[PDB]
Design a protein around this nucleic acid. Structure first.
Length: 1322
RNA sequence: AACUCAAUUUGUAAAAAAGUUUUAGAGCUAGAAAUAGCAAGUUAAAAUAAGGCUAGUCCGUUAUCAACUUGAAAAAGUGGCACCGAGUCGGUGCU
DNA sequence: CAATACTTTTTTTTACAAATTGAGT
DNA sequence: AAAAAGTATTG
């Protein structure tokens, strides 16, 4: 008879076995291998360590980008294949040269100049066209014939870097002058508003709309020059459209629902046509001149510099940059020499220096270039004209930059389209493909169709209409984009928990909505004067109410039910209704939705079209792309008016239900034949409902449901971090093994415990914009300073107090307080979501609750604004104002303190279910569950407090035993608590308010001896705690506080580190230049790294013990070796397939194939004096020993560090009473390090530094000594400091020593071993 | 168990702009030579996990892994119990 | 050999679905 | 976003 405690985490799983005496047993264990010892003694406690589980994100993020690389590639293959035939007549080496452009002349198979094929014709090209964009403007403006190759260059360049698809629609070239397109709008506006014109006299539109300012600010600045017009006015909203915003036109026109417009969405066309069909085509000429403005503002929002009107504005802009870059560089050189010859070298030559040299040829960010060279131009004279060019980031611009991420594909297209429109007259195959080429640029695989696979992709759901190779041209005629677009969602959508072979309906199916109504209705009761007992509605009554009421009103009110039905129908003058209040919660909203559209109640009420409407709601719910919806609904084009169909593809539904069709109106009960909904429609006078129906054993619903229906697969399908799913998984195999260790005897209780900058910038940046506070200019900052909690809050609260309507001075934050909104006396939540910054934390009101109602009633409006700017959360807002909604009641304050001891978390409940399911597998006569084992769930408060309450302090930095100590105490506290209060097996095991408050507040008291309650009393519970009902003793406070104190002193604890073959990337991702080292890896087969460069630092999958021979010396004679060889992730599959051929290829002769031992990372070797080492790779090691530091030093270290009740003296005096423990600890460390660490060089720097600080206060040494365990911590040598004396790490950089050592194959608990002497090989 | 709202986490797809690496952008004068003085510099092609077979405008970095026997694989199978004590586990007795 | 010091890919957008928690009902 | 292995140069 025993029990198991488990402590579950991301990088650890602690475990312990205890007896009814709260003791941890020990056992002899058979030892395997070639060693002498065939047995060993171990304690049935321990832990398990492992590296964290990883999200499938980076893996995906790479993959997603591989497909982009494998498609931009084909965009060229498509383009080259076209030019191919007519290109041959000019140069049958051209495309072949572009391929081998990368190879060195010594390996090129054609002339070394790529574009033309001599050098005098090529050099002249680079002089006429210093940049590609020169060739772009030329191939557009000029009319003369052009060289076909020049053309492929300009075209592919636009295709290889096509720009983004965040804008929908065509952009018109001719739309270019802001100042004029604006004026033609005012004139167009004035045409309809002759009564109220707009005097745009002297309004610099080009200054206000094209400035490098926020879209909103440009609007506010533009309206500010129009005295009379409002921001959310029509013209206001119209400019808001031009600037790229999404305004609302409800108020301007007195409409019903909100009508929004965005010129970038695909809906603007149809969303405008829905508006003009509501205000009149008189305004069509308005929303167009507004668009032409957007098309001119986009450009000014794209070009860094302004320029002459052309047909290639982008390509012309960069020319104006190159020309300026050229212009301003000629100046600087000559400018610098004439005033700073002491530098010209370092600037224009030294690539190591972040000057103009390292700018171009080194790797100097545009930022790093300015940051360095700015004070120079400040020193000299005549540079001021260039300081401007710097501070707007227009000084020596490269053309291929990071800011070019804004360029939409439309800009590029208008140039690619132009070039074709020039040379198609000269080259006729162009005109034949002018569409075919532009399609390549504009084509883009929709997100909802997915990979263009053909059965070999587990990421694919696409359905092929044809069979042939998909191309950008036949995509519509080969891909059923639609049947695939529906698969896209149907994959992720859920199933019916009661019918796990049935998909669930959309949230707005008429069937679900009917089903809701009857389910609510079948529970209404009525009675009036003349009735013996309140009655139930019958089938005939319900069908009436749905017809007369629900299909006539969206919301059905009780007042309606009485005077519209019982009065006007059943002739009841008076009646009393039971089973519903105020109004019904249910509605047929989708029915009224359609009735307001198709305007034919006869068609809707007609039972024949039941299948149709659901498909309409499905199509509406299932898709999001208007083109994909109009396609799916044009099957009902012959059925509804075109005006209807138009207003039909504009309705949207979001949601997926929990229920299927086959459930409610599909399955039937056996002897009745009625469906569930049929039952809801009528059920004699039982009027049962859903929950009552799926359960009545009286009916054939229960059995047929419960007639429906791996391990690691079962866990990966849980919800939660993959890290915890790893720890959750390894938890079972531990329990499954420990059960075996205990002779297949299932335990009785299994206690478990589960452990609990850039982003901050935009958060504030956004919120401040919504409020227009110049606080940013008033107080600029940097995203690495927003870690200062207080400072982060000043900007969240926009510099004002959160409890008092007055401001805060940023300079005085140290004085200001950070108050818990809901106090940590109830739930702990040091998080921004439950904290504010106030000058005095006393202005919140009473400290025993939530901010007082006098605060809410004064600061609510400010808080509301903080929510409209997303500067607080609705949660935070909810708690800030709880007072006016009743505050935290004394009943509320009981759950907060109850939830400190009860695992509310779901993932934790799932583990308990899995364990309870694996243990309890026996069934009795009446088909009930036989519960051999009780699975207990605890929160980490129980033990974290238990330690502090009884001097069992934990210092994590000493070792990894403390994981195992926690799993122990969890078994202790968990079992003892169920023994004492067995009535709480409902809140802890799987299967007047102030009473609850003082109960859960004082539940763990029974361990304590002297109970001191804050209302002045001493109450001593006895020495032995016993159960009231059962006679079992549960806690002898004489023995069991030493039973535990001894267990935590045990020096042998099974610490096991999971042996893990390393997966992932091949090496470091950095591509390195050519150097002559055998360590570079070929980027491509035929790419000698010594010539082209390559990769470096490969990651090792595992190592192998390779006992073989090598050709030593000139005589090619064999010398026996016992080397340790590293298998890199890339080399892996090649090795496993045939290892002997793999090894001999490395110079390994006469390989003993039988002694190739696979050594994963963290493989464990033991050597002399019990020193243990772990493997990190073929030639690096890690420490493999734990320090069983005695307990008295632990608590002393804890207390001497935490020098922060009146029982603190006994604790605080003990410190200065046992100060000699210091030098004793330093000897505890040393005499250990000298034995298993072997950092003699570093150990000096510790003994030299501890001594040097002996004078320092007892606490300051207490702390900095905890740091010393870094020298002794299991794992990899890390760096650490003592006071301010850094101690860099000593690394074990040769694994040669473990080859004559002893290999330790550890079970998951480290109990079952297998010991291999690697000296007996060879 | 419902509903509403909001936040978090996980998982999939579609896109863009960088970055790096070789090559192409004839460097000129002087000096035997290293070295000096000048000139220039912004762009492009190509690769972007080696690569794989099932040959797709697809797949290639997540999850899972002690040893041994058995298996394609998933996975199954394999190691006695009590007491005393404790510096990483010893010692003792029993079948 | 041991000591020492340097390096290690990045940024942005669109679209969907599921739990899960936490506060209102 | 650091841990810590890979790499190189120096004692």
């Amino acid at each position: 008879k025993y029990s198991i405690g488990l402590a579950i985490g991301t990088n650890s799983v602690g475990w312990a076995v205890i007896t009814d005496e709260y003791k941890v047993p020990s056992k002899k264990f058979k030892v395997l291998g070639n060693t002498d010892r065939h047995s060993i003694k171990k304690n049935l406690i321990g832990a398990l360590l492992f590296d964290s589980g990883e999200t499938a994100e980076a893996t995906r993020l790479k993959r997603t980008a591989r497909r982009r690389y494998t498609r931009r590639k084909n965009r060229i293959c498509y383009l080259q294949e076209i030019f191919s035939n007519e290109m041959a007549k000019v140069d049958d080496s051209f495309f072949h040269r572009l391929e081998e452009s990368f190879l060195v002349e010594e390996d090129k198979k054609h002339e070394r100049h790529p574009i033309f094929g001599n050098i005098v014709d090529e050099v002249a090209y680079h002089e006429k066209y210093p940049t590609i964009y020169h060739l772009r403007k030329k191939l557009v403006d000029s009319t003369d014939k052009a060289d076909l190759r020049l053309i492929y260059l300009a075209l592919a360049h636009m295709i290889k870097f096509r720009g983004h698809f965040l804008i929908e629609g065509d952009l018109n070239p001719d739309n270019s002058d802001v100042d004029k397109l604006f004026i033609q709008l005012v004139q167009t506006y004035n045409q309809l508003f002759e009564e109220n014109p707009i005097n745009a006299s002297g309004v610099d539109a080009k200054a206000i709309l094209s400035a490098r300012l926020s879209k909103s600010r440009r609007l506010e600045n533009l309206i500010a020059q129009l005295p009379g017009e409002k921001k959310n006015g029509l013209f206001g909203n119209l400019i808001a459209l031009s600037l790229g915003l999404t305004p609302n036109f409800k108020s301007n026109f007195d409409l019903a629902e909100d009508t929004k417009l965005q010129l970038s969405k695909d809906t603007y066309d149809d969303d405008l046509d829905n508006l003009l069909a509501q205000i009149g085509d008189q305004y069509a000429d308005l929303f167009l001149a507004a668009k032409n403005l957007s098309d001119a503002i986009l450009l000014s929002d794209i070009l860094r510099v302004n320029t002459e009107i052309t047909k290639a504005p982008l390509s012309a802009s960069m020319i104006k940059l190159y020309d300026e870059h050229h212009q301003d560089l000629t100046l600087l050189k000559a400018l610098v020499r004439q005033q700073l010859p002491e530098k010209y070298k370092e600037i224009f030559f030294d690539q190591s220096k972040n000057g103009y040299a390292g700018y171009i040829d080194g790797g100097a960010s545009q930022e790093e270039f300015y940051k360095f060279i700015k004070p120079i131009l400040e020193k000299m004279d005549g540079t001021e004209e260039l300081l401007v060019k710097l501070n707007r980031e227009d000084l020596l611009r490269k053309q291929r930059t990071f800011d070019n991420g804004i360029i939409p594909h439309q800009i590029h297209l208008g140039e690619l389209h132009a070039i074709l429109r020039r040379q198609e007259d000269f080259y006729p195959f162009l005109k034949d493909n002018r569409e075919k080429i532009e399609k390549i640029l504009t084509f883009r695989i929709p997100y909802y169709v997915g990979p263009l696979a053909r059965g070999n992709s587990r990421f694919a759901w696409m359905t092929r209409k044809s069979e042939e190779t998909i191309t950008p041209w036949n995509f519509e005629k080969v891909v059923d984009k639609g049947a695939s677009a529906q698969s896209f969602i149907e994959r992720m959508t859920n199933f019916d928990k009661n019918l796990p072979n049935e998909k669930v309906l959309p949230k707005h199916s008429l069937l679900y909505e009917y089903f809701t109504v009857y389910n609510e209705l079948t529970k209404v009761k009525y009675v009036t004067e003349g009735m013996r007992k309140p009655a139930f509605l019958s089938g005939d009554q319900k069908k009436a109410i749905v017809d007369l009421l629900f299909k006539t009103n969206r919301k059905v009110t009780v007042k309606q039910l009485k005077e519209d039905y019982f009065k006007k129908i059943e002739c009841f003058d008076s009646v009393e209704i039971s089973g519903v209040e105020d109004r019904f919660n249910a509605s047929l909203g989708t029915y009224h939705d359609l009735l307001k559209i198709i305007k034919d109640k006869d068609f809707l009420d007609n039972e024949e079209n039941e299948d149709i409407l659901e498909d309409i709601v499905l199509t509406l719910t299932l898709f999001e792309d208007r083109e994909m919806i109009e396609e799916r609904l044009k099957t009902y084009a012959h059925l509804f008016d075109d005006k209807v169909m138009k207003q039909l593809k504009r309705r949207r539904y979001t949601g997926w239900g929990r229920l299927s069709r086959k459930l409610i109106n599909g399955i039937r009960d056996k002897q009745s034949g009625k469906t569930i909904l049929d039952f809801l429609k009528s059920d004699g006078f039982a009027n049962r409902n859903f929950i009552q129906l799926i359960h009545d054993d009286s009916l054939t619903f229960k059995e047929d449901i419960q007639k429906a229906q791996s391990l690691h697969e079962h866990i990966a399908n849980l919800a939660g971090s993959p890290a915890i799913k790893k720890g959750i998984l390894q938890t079972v195999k531990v329990v499954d093994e420990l059960v075996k260790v205990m002779g297949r005897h299932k335990p009785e209780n299994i206690v478990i415990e589960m452990a609990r900058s850039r982003e901050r910038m935009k958060r504030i940046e956004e919120g401040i914009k919504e409020l227009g506070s110049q606080i940013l200019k008033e107080h600029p900052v940097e995203n690495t300073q927003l870690q200062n909690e207080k400072l982060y809050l000043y900007y969240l609260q926009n510099g004002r107090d959160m409890y008092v309507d007055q401001e805060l001075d940023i300079n005085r934050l140290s004085d200001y307080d950070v108050d818990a909104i809901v106090p940590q006396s109830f739930l702990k939540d040091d998080s921004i979501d439950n904290k504010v910054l106030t000058r005095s934390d006393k202005n919140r009101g009473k400290s025993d609750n939530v901010p007082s109602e006098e605060v809410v009633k004064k600061m609510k409006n400010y808080w509301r604004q903080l929510l409209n700017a997303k500067l607080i959360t609705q949660r935070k807002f909810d708690n800030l104002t709880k007072a006016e909604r009743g505050g935290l009641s004394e009943l509320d304050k009981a759950g907060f303190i109850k939830r400190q001891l009860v695992e509310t978390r779901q993932i934790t409940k799932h583990v308990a279910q899995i364990l309870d399911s694996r243990m309890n597998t026996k069934y009795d006569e009446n088909d009930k569950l036989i519960r051999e084992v009780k699975v207990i769930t605890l929160k980490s408060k129980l033990v974290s407090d238990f330690r502090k309450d009884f001097q069992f302090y934990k210092v994590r930095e000493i070792n990894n035993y403390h994981h195992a100590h926690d799993a122990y105490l969890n078994a202790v506290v968990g079992t003892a608590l169920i023994k004492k209060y067995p009535k709480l097996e409902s809140e802890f095991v799987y299967g007047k308010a102030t009473a609850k408050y003082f109960f859960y507040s004082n539940i763990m008291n029974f361990f304590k001896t002297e109970i001191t309650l804050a209302n002045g009393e001493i109450r001593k519970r006895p020495l032995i705690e016993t159960n009231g009902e059962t006679g079992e003793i549960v806690w002898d406070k004489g023995r069991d506080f030493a039973t535990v104190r001894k267990v935590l002193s045990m020096p042998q604890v099974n610490i096991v580190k999971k042996t893990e073959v390393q997966t992932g990337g091949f090496s470091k991702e950095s591509i390195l230049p050519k150097r002559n080292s055998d360590k570079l890896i070929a980027r491509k087969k035929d790419w000698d790294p010594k010539k082209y460069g390559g990769f470096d630092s490969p990651t090792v999958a595992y190592s192998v013990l390779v006992v073989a021979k090598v050709e030593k010396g000139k005589s090619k004679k064999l010398k026996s070796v016992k080397e340790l060889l590293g298998i890199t992730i890339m080399e892996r599959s090649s090795f496993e397939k045939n290892p002997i051929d793999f090894l001999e290829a490395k110079g390994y002769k006469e390989v003993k194939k039988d002694l190739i031992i696979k050594l994963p990372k963290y493989s464990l070797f033991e050597l002399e004096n019990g020193r243990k080492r772990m493997l990190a790779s073929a030639g690096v090691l890690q420490k493999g020993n734990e320090l069983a530091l005695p307990s008295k030093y632990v608590n002393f270290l804890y207390l001497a560090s935490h020098y922060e009740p009146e029982d603190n003296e006994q604790k605080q005096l003990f410190v200065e009473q046992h100060k000699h423990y210091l030098d004793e600890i330093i000897e505890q460390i040393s005499e250990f390090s000298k034995r298993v660490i072997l950092a003699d060089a570093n150990l000096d720097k510790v003994l030299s530094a501890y001594n040097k600080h002996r004078d320092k206060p007892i606490r300051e040494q207490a702390e900095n000594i905890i740091h010393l365990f870094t020298l002794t911590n299991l794992g990899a040598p890390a760096a650490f400091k003592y006071f301010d004396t850094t101690i860099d790490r000593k690394r074990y950089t040769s694994t040669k020593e473990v080859l004559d050592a002893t290999l330790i194959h550890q079970s998951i608990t480290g109990l079952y071993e297998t010991r291999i002497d690697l000296s007996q090989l060879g």
